[PDB]
Design a protein around this ligand. Structure first.
Ligand SMILES: O[C@@H]1[C@@H](O)[C@@H](O)CO[C@H]1O
Ligand SMILES: O[C@@H]1[C@@H](O)[C@@H](O)CO[C@H]1O
Lengths: 164, 161
């Protein structure tokens, strides 16, 4: 189960939805102090989460997208004053030419943040969901599609931030 | 105007819609007898076209997707029995790893053909429209986005067959 400790993330893209509910089986903090081998993109869809990094804390809310590069600390979970923290996520290894699009302004350390304009929220949420659906497919082209959709999301962000 | 002959198609992706109407300004056959350097994907969205190749003819209708690889003859226009032939198209240079997804069954010579089933039709039409939108947009990422959406279409076809 990728939603619980013990799972091995390495070369393959893995995607899912973590529906944390207070006092439930997922009500614990993701705690990977040494970081991961690949990247993780995280979209909050309901509730609130608290992201911690060496004494600092950041409250993420529905519509916020976070970026965790390889080696970066992962220490986040349901915000103590929130009933839940539902977040979609995708673990991945980038294609070579994606690096310009992985340069996001940090909330702290090297943990990136992106929040689409309210008007664009629906598209990004829908796109993120398409990534999960593809990521969890078993077809010969499932992973390739998930990777492609992720690339689309990174490009849509590039257009979004440069819209003016 | 890429819609008119003499346009220089080279390394940049170019996309558009050619709304051919009988007797209108676009009512002529595209004719590139020695082909092009890049690929062209073509989706018919209205009316009917006639694709020709050294005497042979193929009538394409709404929902038909054709693939013209580099060097392939381009000779096509409004079908004589149709009042129009609106087709969306995208000229491109592929990413290296796309080649395994570009070997489509051919109507003749090496002109590929793909007709999504009725269930997949709306999604592919929707996707092609997004390609044209991205390809015609302004900014430093319009072309990359179009390339991205194109790769998606290629992958959805592989998945659909
Ligand atoms: O819930 C977590 C998710 O936030 C991401 O870190 C991947 O692993 C899952 O277990
Ligand atoms: O209308 C054509 C189109 O079909 C494609 O060949 C690109 O060039 C345009 O002029």
């Amino acid at each position: 189960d990728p939603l619980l400790p013990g799972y091995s993330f390495n070369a393959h893209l893995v995607a899912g939805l973590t529906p944390i509910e207070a006092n439930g089986y997922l009500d614990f903090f993701i705690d990977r102090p040494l970081g991961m081998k690949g990247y993780i993109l995280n979209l909050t869809i309901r509730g609130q989460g608290v992201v911690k990094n060496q004494g600092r804390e950041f409250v993420c809310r529905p519509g916020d997208i976070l970026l965790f590069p390889p080696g970066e600390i992962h220490h986040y979970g349901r915000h103590p004053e929130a009933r839940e923290w539902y977040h979609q996520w995708v673990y991945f290894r980038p294609r070579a030419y994606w690096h310009e699009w992985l340069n996001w302004p940090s909330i702290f350390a090297n943990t990136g943040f992106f929040r689409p304009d309210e008007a664009h929220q629906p598209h990004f949420s829908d796109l993120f969901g398409q990534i999960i659906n593809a990521g969890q497919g078993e077809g010969r082209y499932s992973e390739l599609l998930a990777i492609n959709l992720l690339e689309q999301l990174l490009l849509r962000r590039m257009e979004a931030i440069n819209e003016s």
